[PDB]
Design a protein around this ligand. Structure first.
Ligand SMILES: Nc1ncnc2c1ncn2[C@@H]1O[C@H](COP(=O)(O)OP(=O)(O)O)[C@@H](O)[C@H]1O
Lengths: 146, 231, 240, 234, 239, 256, 129, 240, 220, 48
């Protein structure tokens, strides 16, 4: 976001941004170049990026809800030898506030736990121990509950 | 409700109250005013500059009376002025209910100063942003006091307040002296308000309230109209 | 040029200004509407455009022309919820005055009570300063029509003709030139000036279904809200 | 950086009661052993200087005539809890003509263990949790019962619990030497054997005080010069 | 540097209150309880836990009235406070109207009670979760309360740490819950509860408790003495 | 809410109170007052911070505040914040006179106002009272007393005091130039004039920047007097001649 | 600044310059003589958004039922370019199920999609000159 | 950054970010649709289950304030229940101290002020609920009002509140609600709900409907369960 | 590593100058006031170049005087140079012992305070010899006065024992401040060598310089 | 992908760090290290 500030670090970036905006849309329009932009925050971007031909569509990417999470683990475990008594809905129900990368890290961690005990095909408890590692829960001492 | 009840006016490490100085700087960017006590009565003058000709000048007022012999003008913020005017009126009525005598101006000044002090000290509220100028002819001798937003008060023969007040103070020290009359005090108050006013000076711009031994009187536009000519 | 908590709570800046009322003014022109009040010789008129962007929305409950008392009318600008809270507070204070002091409350005293209520909001540091505007019209015997405008900062003042909302500067710039030649300000002249002010500021030539006009006068002191037939008549009389 | 007294952790447990749990092991140790013929208590006085009179420091404070207690932590905080427990026992005796069970007085003293508040009212309500763990022992109606209370208000029945600085060491040394079928003298000897290596000072008849509650004897005995009978055997 | 997640008053840019989710994380740290019902009975079976080798197990089920019985998972002081509120409300209902309180208006009362602290300043959410079984005039009910004050009219559900296996078992063995008697229903409850445990130890008749309410049966709690008629006749763990 | 709190109760990492000291630094400038007694009669000397020419001066009062038949008080620091304290101690004295039907002793009034000042630093969350004042009085038990005070509620009896501007040199000269039990009420006034010549940087001070108020005792009256400007001028002149007298010792000796 | 007026004056040379923030420019740049007239371009009004939409919906093979008045009503604070995106997005919904002709329901649907996106970039309102 | 913490803190742009975050929490719920007609008001709520977590009728979002007033909520739950008991208390107080039934406009205004009393101070947080209020009386016709968490109440001939709101108001705009009766607008509401719901991401949808009107002679009640509610079969017939 | 701490003025650095004459290798002195930079980046570069020069030369000794000015705490983490100081100390923490610890380089650090220090510095492996500097009451104060008055005259009337007899709260910086100023009255008055009243008024004025305006009438 | 944590050892690892750090010494074969690890409850490898 361009504002009133000091130094030369921001002013060089704003110089390159104003070069980017004119060469993308405005004088000499071009069809033959298609631009794709990605970010993780949008509150920082300048409103001149949300103009006519700069950024045409604004696309959301929410966190996976239930069936997307069961779909992710099915895709990543395609190469792995999986024992055919595992139901992914129970995993997707237990795994909460995850993403695509975290559900990917569950499958890789589960396959190693079978390698630690040397078993080839997986099991349900291989996945659950992968779940407990991914959550990264610190030492608790929470034995004064319930 | 919330009920903060914590005081947010605290001492600086240099040993001063920063909010009091900020309120005094708010006062110094206010409307100009002058007050002259000269040997028969007190004259208070100020400036009403509207941003447009569509305003009604006679609707709101700035030389607001309190009793039949006590007057008040201000320099600062307008919304923070009607509140202490109403408080001073109610307090003077309580004094008249108890003691059955018109309230002397000095006691009014100490009690509004104590009100300003307890607004500074108490919890969850900001200090006031208005310097007062209280005039009155009680027991023969005229009185003119000024109370700052710190909650203190002084006594002045002739003082000025608001924007460009140090040169007005030098004007009042140089041109005026110890003994005047009422009419030439009105003349020099109009002059020292004219030292920082606009090109025109009519009764629609300036507002003058005088006091004497016959009671407090806010001047009509006719009296200020013929006073503003050739002065 | 802040002092840590200068942005958030209502306190004095080092420059002397208190910033929360200045950030609350933007709530008046955030809403996107403009309202003009014009006072003449024997009438006071209020004109406000209304926005109905969806056909399923009821068009009879959009109007900001609120009724305070049977001879005292008002209009709003800014956030609608704070405007309705001020409407209910003004109705309660008018009824309280009519119960207490026996006679009908004048317009300026109601505006003083509203301003004194709004001053405590900027005095203390625990409440939002309630960013909505106030325009009141009425008739007072041996004073004629009266029009007043209060403020979220608590500053009330009398007026001859004024506007509030988003387009205050251009409307006042046109209105000063309109009022500078003091002509015969009758009823038709006042409604023509009030309509043409918004017609020249916005340059839209509005249909009669999107303009609300409130009237008060000396011939009858009752507050009236003009229906579409008289707005039709005034708009076809305006077009020569 | 600074949060309120009622704030939950990101992992979900709490943010102030766990700090009161963390303040338990800055105090002295206290061992309570329940046996089918009586409940025995023991504590470390933790003297600092020879000029301090050792009989002033007390940890075993009686609540009712048949109920004892033992402290670990900040004694001044637990004085209010013990006074309140005395008030509840006398009120229940006055309104029901019978003695309290030790579970009921532990419940009554644990109800107000977690009642701190900032938005709350009253004439200065508690602003922080109490930093003590209390052991209660008694013979109410089912015989010998021993209870342990921690600053989260959780009370449980324990057969042989030790609290304080070396609570885990005394517990792990209490695991092997215990059984349900033992006697009171064996319990006192075993508790003193455990308390031998826990303390950083040398044991004598003035560094500890112990108390035994039995169905026969009303209050708890074994003051000074009665401790010397079992000290010389150790 | 974290911001927005130190008080219940502050919202989030994503539009949620993180303190309520922290209270959910608190309530999922307790031991697993299972509550289920038939056409004529309501049984909740809870698993006790041991804080030490020789310390006794903390009980979970505790009776509220002649027909309402609640379970618990989470804290204990707030549990006693809420349970005292249920007891006082049931006493006022039996004192004024001389009738049993229905469980639906009781949990509506506790929802209105628990929603007040999660709106004001400096008041924490209640970190407890209840499973409420009750036989009022029209059918038995088993209800589940949350620290978000969203009560759900469940039919067979489990709460606590590692309750997903119990939920999947109750899903796959749902339909044959109303046609069976109490003896088979209790065995179904223990079969649902034993999936929470790891496959090394079992229900050793000292860490379980069973509470039953019914049409003509008083709300009874069995722990370590009347439990043993229910543990016999149970199949071994398939591992 | 809670982040807006100014935290005027907690100690500092060295363990000493952190807000009262800023009030004491505020007392440390903006004013000058002192009091002297060693026999009958006790005097107060004060300095006018504002000597602007447009002041009326007809207020017939100064920092010297009368509060009883047999007392006086002089304030220092914030002038706005001293009216509350003077009214409170006047109320305390009148409540004692209503209760016991005798005039209040000095110790009880000073301790009562110091407890009231301490109550704000103990709790309440408000800012402390930024006023340190100084009492003179007469009593049945101990005669003429002079009492100092602090914003923290600390107090103490004194015979030569220090409350105002830069005055460590004034404390040193009060130590060096003081007599014990021989101070009749004509040498103490000259001592006060000699001190206030040196504390203030204005050389050859006039009767506009000095205020002298004496509490003496008549035959059962306890006359509290504020000295007019007609006698303060020649009281200053009687010390102004003393410098020229003292410079003559180095003039008639250097002759060989 | 120097070659704008300087010593050698210009003849038949006109310079046009445009920006988004006029407040951050130099006062010596913005003084008259070098920039004689400042031209303000604002957000379009109701009839201004109407004939912009008439131009952009020109080469669209629409079915002859389209009413632009309802479309312009649910667009306040739009730029002069989001209406071009509205005309673009209506053909995208025509591309869905290859409906060829553009129906006014797609215009009402595409307007609500664009006004959904116009909530994460605002508060521009820069001071004139 | 720091303006979005408390409700009593104005942004530099003049906004109050806490009620905006409340609206963000509002739009994550499921869709609730209310259509006004010439003879009554029909509600419709798309209830969502996960595996069961419910019986038939559990987590009900159709409340009942009074005999003639219907309430359908969409937002963060347990505040809907609090507002339901609040509106019940206002209705009972009006019946006790004024005799006759509470009008819908007055009740919506009262609950709107109760909602607005929470977005002023810093102690309390704004609500996360946006409900509906529909009623039918012989002397007042059929009315429907919608209240947002900011505290603004407007009348509507048809509106939708929830996640799929912008994809549902167009389907309401397709039909002409000024002329149909209740018996076809229930199946139109079911068709709108079936169209607007996505089955790829949730697949656990279930309708619930409601009724005020002359068919339910001025009383609020649920559509008669297994009798009727074949509008789901009609909407499955309108799958394309 | 050796760290020297104490009350402000006791022996701190002084002792450090006295050890830099009996040493055999070269001695490098740096000051913590120098260890800030207004340019973002020259901070850790100067620390790195300081130890690189010292390592290649000899078995040298690096003395970071006033190291407590930078490495005090890290809990603030607020934007600006106040967090850049935390960044410029982390390189010093890594270059002290973070990978392949350098041979024959001996560090010595002088602080004024203890508790406002980063505990990752306080742990062993970087500094071990924690040295405490107390203020001597009277015994070495005779020898400090013996040293400071050695290279000057002294008369029979002036004796220094009574000037320190009742006082037990001075420091070695103040004693030199006494002795330098007590020679300054004799030069400014063109008087004799030393008088007893030269020492009397030097003690009073140095007390005014050390303790001037601390607001403690209430004894905490 | 892994968050490997460290902490204040145990009781046994202090004895192991003693046996691997103090093995390069000229000490008679009579020192017991488990008592020395008992006497220092909470320590790092750097302290050893
Ligand atoms: N025991 C002593 N012998 C001689 N001089 C000393 C002694 N103690 C302190 N000093 C003097 O005090 C001064 C302060 O030394 P030091 O504490 O290292 O400096 P700083 O106070 O600036 O850190 C030195 O200049 C030294 O001459």
């Amino acid at each position: 976001k361009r504002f009133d500030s000091e130094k030369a670090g921001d002013r060089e970036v704003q110089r390159t941004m104003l070069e980017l905006l004119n060469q993308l849309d405005g004088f000499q329009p071009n069809t033959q170049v298609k631009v794709i932009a990605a970010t993780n925050r949008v509150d920082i971007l300048d409103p001149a990026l949300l103009r006519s031909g700069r950024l045409d569509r604004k696309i959301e990417f929410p966190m996976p809800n239930e069936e997307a999470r069961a779909r992710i683990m099915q895709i990543h475990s395609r190469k792995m030898n999986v024992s055919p008594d595992v139901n992914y809905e129970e995993l997707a129900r237990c795994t909460d506030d995850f993403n695509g990368a975290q559900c990917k890290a569950v499958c890789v961690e589960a396959g190693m736990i079978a390698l630690r005990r040397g078993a080839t095909e997986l099991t349900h408890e291989d996945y659950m121990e992968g779940i407990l590692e991914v959550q990264a829960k610190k030492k608790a001492n929470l034995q004064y509950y319930a | 409700e919330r009920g903060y009840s914590f005081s947010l006016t605290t001492f600086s490490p240099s040993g001063k109250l920063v909010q009091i100085e900020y309120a005094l700087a708010a006062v110094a960017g206010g409307a100009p005013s002058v007050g002259i006590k000269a040997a028969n009565g007190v004259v208070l003058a100020t400036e009403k500059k509207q941003k447009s000709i569509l305003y009604d000048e006679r609707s709101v007022h700035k030389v607001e009376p309190i009793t039949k012999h006590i007057g008040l003008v201000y320099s600062g913020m307008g919304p923070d002025y009607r509140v202490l005017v109403h408080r001073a009126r109610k307090l003077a009525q309580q004094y008249y209910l108890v003691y059955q005598e018109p309230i002397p101006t000095a006691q009014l000044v100490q009690r509004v100063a104590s009100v300003m002090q307890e607004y500074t000290q108490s919890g969850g509220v900001r200090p006031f942003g208005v310097s007062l100028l209280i005039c009155g002819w009680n027991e023969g001798r005229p009185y003119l006091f000024q109370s700052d937003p710190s909650g203190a008060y002084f006594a002045w023969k002739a003082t000025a307040m608001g924007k460009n007040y140090v040169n007005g103070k030098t004007f009042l020290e140089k041109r005026y002296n110890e003994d005047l009359e009422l009419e030439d005090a009105i003349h020099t108050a109009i002059l020292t308000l004219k030292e920082s006013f606009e090109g025109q000076m009519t009764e629609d711009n300036i507002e003058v309230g005088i006091c004497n031994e016959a009671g407090f009187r806010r001047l009509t536009p006719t009296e200020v109209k013929d006073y503003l000519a050739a002065i | 040029s802040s002092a840590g908590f200068d942005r958030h709570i209502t306190i004095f800046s080092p420059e002397g200004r208190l910033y929360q009322v200045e950030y609350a003014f933007k709530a008046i022109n955030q809403g996107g509407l403009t309202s003009v009040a014009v006072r003449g010789k024997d009438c006071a008129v209020i004109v406000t455009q209304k926005k109905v962007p969806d056909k399923l929305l009821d068009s009879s409950t959009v109007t900001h022309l609120f009724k305070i008392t049977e001879n005292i009318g008002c209009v709003m600008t800014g956030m609608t919820a704070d405007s309705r809270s001020q409407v209910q507070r003004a109705r309660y204070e008018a009824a309280n005055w009519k119960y207490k002091y026996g006679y009908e409350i004048p317009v300026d005293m109601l505006c003083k009570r509203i301003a004194d209520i709004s001053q405590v909001y900027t005095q203390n540091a625990e409440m939002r300063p309630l960013g909505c505007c106030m325009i009141l019209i009425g008739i007072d015997e041996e004073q004629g029509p009266q029009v007043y405008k209060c403020d979220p900062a608590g500053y009330y003042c009398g007026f001859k003709a004024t506007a509030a909302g988003v387009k205050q500067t251009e409307s006042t710039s046109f209105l000063e030139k309109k009022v500078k030649k003091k002509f015969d300000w009758t009823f038709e002249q006042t409604v023509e000036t009030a309509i043409t002010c918004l017609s020249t500021v916005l340059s839209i030539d509005f249909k009669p279904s999107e303009i609300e006009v409130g009237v008060v006068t000396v011939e009858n002191p009752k507050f009236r809200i003009l229906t579409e037939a008289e707005i039709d008549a005034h708009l076809v009389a305006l077009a020569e | 950086y600074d949060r309120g007294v009622n704030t939950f952790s990101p992992e979900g447990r709490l943010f102030q009661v766990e700090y009161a749990i963390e303040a338990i092991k800055l105090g002295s140790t206290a061992i309570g052993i329940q046996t089918s013929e009586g409940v025995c208590l023991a504590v470390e006085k933790r003297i600092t200087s020879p000029l301090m009179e050792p009989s002033s420091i007390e940890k075993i404070v009686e609540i009712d005539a048949h109920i004892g207690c033992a402290m670990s932590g900040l004694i001044a905080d637990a004085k209010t809890l013990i006074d309140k427990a005395r008030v509840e026992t006398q009120n229940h005796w006055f309104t029901y003509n019978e003695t309290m069970t030790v579970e009921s007085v532990t419940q009554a003293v644990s109800n107000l263990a977690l009642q701190f508040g900032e938005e709350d009212a009253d004439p200065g309500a508690m602003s922080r949790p109490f930093g003590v763990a209390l052991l209660f022992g008694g013979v109410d109606e089912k015989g010998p019962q021993l209870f342990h209370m921690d600053p989260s208000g959780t009370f449980v029945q324990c057969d042989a619990r030790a609290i304080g600085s070396a609570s885990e060491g005394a517990q792990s040394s209490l695991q092997e030497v215990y059984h349900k079928s033992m006697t009171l003298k064996e319990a006192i000897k075993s508790s003193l054997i455990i308390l031998k290596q826990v303390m950083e000072e040398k044991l004598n008849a003035t560094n500890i005080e112990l108390a035994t509650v039995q169905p026969g004897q009303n209050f708890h005995m074994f003051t000074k010069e009665e401790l010397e009978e079992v000290i010389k055997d150790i | 540097r974290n911001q927005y997640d130190n008080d219940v008053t502050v919202w989030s840019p994503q539009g949620r209150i993180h303190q309520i989710e922290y209270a959910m994380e608190a309530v999922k740290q307790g031991s697993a309880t299972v509550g289920l019902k038939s056409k004529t009975h309501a049984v909740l079976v809870a698993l006790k836990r041991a804080q030490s080798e020789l310390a006794a197990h903390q009980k979970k089920i505790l009776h509220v009235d002649n027909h309402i019985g609640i379970s618990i998972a989470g804290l204990t002081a707030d549990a006693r406070l809420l349970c005292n509120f249920m007891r006082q409300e049931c006493l006022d209902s039996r004192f004024v109207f001389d009738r049993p309180l229905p469980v639906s208006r009781l949990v509506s009362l506790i929802g209105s009670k628990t929603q007040i602290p999660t709106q004001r300043y400096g008041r924490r959410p209640y970190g407890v979760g209840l499973l409420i079984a009750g036989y009022d005039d029209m059918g038995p009910h088993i209800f589940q309360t949350c620290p978000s004050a969203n009560y759900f009219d469940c039919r067979a559900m489990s709460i606590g740490a590692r309750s997903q296996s119990a939920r999947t078992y109750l899903e796959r063995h749902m339909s044959e819950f109303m046609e069976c008697n109490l003896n088979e229903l209790v065995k179904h409850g223990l079969r649902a509860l034993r999936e929470t445990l790891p496959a090394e130890q079992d229900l050793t008749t000292k860490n379980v408790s069973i509470g039953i309410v019914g049409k003509d049966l008083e709300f009874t709690i069995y722990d370590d003495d009347d439990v043993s008629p229910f543990l016999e006749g149970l199949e071994e763990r398939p591992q | 809410s809670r982040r807006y709190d100014s935290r005027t109760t907690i100690f500092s990492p060295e363990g000493r109170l952190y807000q009262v000291e800023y009030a004491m630094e505020a007392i440390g400038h903006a004013g000058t007052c002192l009091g002297i007694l060693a026999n009958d009669g006790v005097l107060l000397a004060a300095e006018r911070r504002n000597i602007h020419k447009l002041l009326d001066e007809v207020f017939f009062s100064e920092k010297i505040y009368k509060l009883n038949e047999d007392m006086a008080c002089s304030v220092a620091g914030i002038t706005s914040d001293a009216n509350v304290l003077t009214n409170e101690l006047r109320l305390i004295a009148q409540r004692y006179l209503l209760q016991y039907q005798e005039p209040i002793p000095c110790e009880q009034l000073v301790t009562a106002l110091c407890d009231i000042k301490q109550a704000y630093t103990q709790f309440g969350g408000k800012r402390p009272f930024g006023v340190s004042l100084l009492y003179i009085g007469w009593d049945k038990h101990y005669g003429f007393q002079l009492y100092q005070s602090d914003p923290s509620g600390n107090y103490g009896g004194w015979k030569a005091t220090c409350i105002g501007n830069n005055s460590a040199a004034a404390v040193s000269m009060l130590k060096q130039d003081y007599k014990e039990g021989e101070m009749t009420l004509k040498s103490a006034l000259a001592l006060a004039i000699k001190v206030l010549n040196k504390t203030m940087d204005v050389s050859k001070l006039s009767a506009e920047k000095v205020e002298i108020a004496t509490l003496t005792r008549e035959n059962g009256k306890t006359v509290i007097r504020v000295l007019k400007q007609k006698e303060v001028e020649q009281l200053i002149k009687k010390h102004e001649e003393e410098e020229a007298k003292a410079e003559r010792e180095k003039k008639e000796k250097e002759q060989k | 600044l120097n070659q704008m007026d300087g010593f050698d004056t210009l003849h038949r040379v006109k310079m046009i310059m445009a920006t988004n923030r006029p407040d951050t420019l130099d006062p010596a740049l913005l003084r008259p003589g070098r920039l004689d007239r400042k031209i303000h371009i604002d957000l379009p009004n109701e009839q201004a958004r109407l004939d912009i939409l008439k131009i952009h919906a020109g080469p669209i093979t629409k079915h002859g039922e389209i009413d632009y008045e309802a479309i312009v009503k649910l667009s306040d604070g739009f730029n002069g370019a989001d209406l071009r995106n509205v005309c673009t997005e209506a053909g995208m919904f025509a591309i869905r199920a290859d409906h060829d002709f553009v129906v006014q329901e797609d215009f009402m649907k595409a307007v609500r999609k664009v006004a959904d996106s116009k909530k994460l970039e605002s508060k521009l309102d820069y001071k004139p000159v | 950054t720091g303006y979005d913490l408390s409700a009593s803190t104005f942004s530099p742009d003049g906004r109050v970010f806490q009620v905006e975050y409340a609206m963000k929490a509002v739009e994550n719920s499921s869709t609730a649709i209310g259509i006004r007609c010439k003879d009554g008001v029909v509600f419709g709520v798309e209830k969502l289950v996960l595996s069961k977590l419910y019986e038939e009728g559990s987590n009900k979002r159709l409340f009942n304030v009074d005999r003639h007033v219907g309430m359908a909520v969409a937002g963060l739950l347990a505040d809907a229940r609090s507002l339901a008991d609040i509106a019940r208390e206002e209705a009972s107080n009006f019946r006790s101290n004024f005799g006759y039934n509470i009008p819908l406009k007055h009740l919506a205004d009262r609950v709107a002020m109760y909602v607005h009393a929470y977005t002023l101070y810093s102690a309390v947080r704004p609500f996360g609920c946006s409900f509906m209020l529909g009623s039918y009386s012989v002397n007042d016709g059929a009315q429907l009002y919608m209240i947002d968490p900011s505290g603004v109440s407007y009348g509507y001939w048809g509106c939708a509140i929830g996640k799929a709101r912008q994809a549902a108001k167009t389907e309401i705009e397709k039909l002409q609600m000024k002329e149909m009766t209740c018996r076809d607008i229930v199946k139109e509401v079911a068709k709108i709900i079936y169209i607007v719901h996505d089955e790829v991401k949730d697949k656990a949808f279930e309708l619930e409907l409601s009724w005020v009107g002359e068919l339910t002679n001025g009383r609020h009640e649920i559509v008669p369960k297994d009798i009727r509610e074949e509008a789901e079969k009609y909407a499955k017939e309108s799958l394309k | 590593g050796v760290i020297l701490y104490g009350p402000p003025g006791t022996g701190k650095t002084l002792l450090a100058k006295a050890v830099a004459n009996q040493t055999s290798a070269t001695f490098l002195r740096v000051v913590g006031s120098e260890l800030i930079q207004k340019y973002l980046g020259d901070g850790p570069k100067l620390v790195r170049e300081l130890f690189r020069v010292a390592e290649e030369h000899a078995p040298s000794i690096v003395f970071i005087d006033e190291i407590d000015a930078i490495g005090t705490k890290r809990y603030d983490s607020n934007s600006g140079g106040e967090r850049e100081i935390q960044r410029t100390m982390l390189e010093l923490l890594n270059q002290l012992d973070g990978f392949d610890s350098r041979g024959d380089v001996k560090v010595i650090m002088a602080t004024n305070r203890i508790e406002t220090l980063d505990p990752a510095l306080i742990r062993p492996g970087r500094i071990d010899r924690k040295i405490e500097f107390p203020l001597p009451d009277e015994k070495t104060k005779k020898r400090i006065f013996q040293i400071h008055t050695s290279r000057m005259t002294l008369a029979d009337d002036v004796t220094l024992d009574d000037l320190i007899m009742a006082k037990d709260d001075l420091s070695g910086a103040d004693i030199k401040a006494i002795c330098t100023e007590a020679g300054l009255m004799a030069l400014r008055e063109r008087r004799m060598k030393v008088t007893n009243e030269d020492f009397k008024k030097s003690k009073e004025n140095v007390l005014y310089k050390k303790q001037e305006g601390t607001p403690e009438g209430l004894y905490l | 992908d892994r968050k490997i944590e460290f902490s204040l050892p145990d009781l046994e690892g202090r004895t192991h760090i003693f046996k691997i750090h103090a093995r390069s010494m000229s000490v008679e074969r009579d020192i017991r290290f488990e008592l020395l690890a008992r006497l220092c409850p909470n320590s790092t490898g750097a302290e050893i």
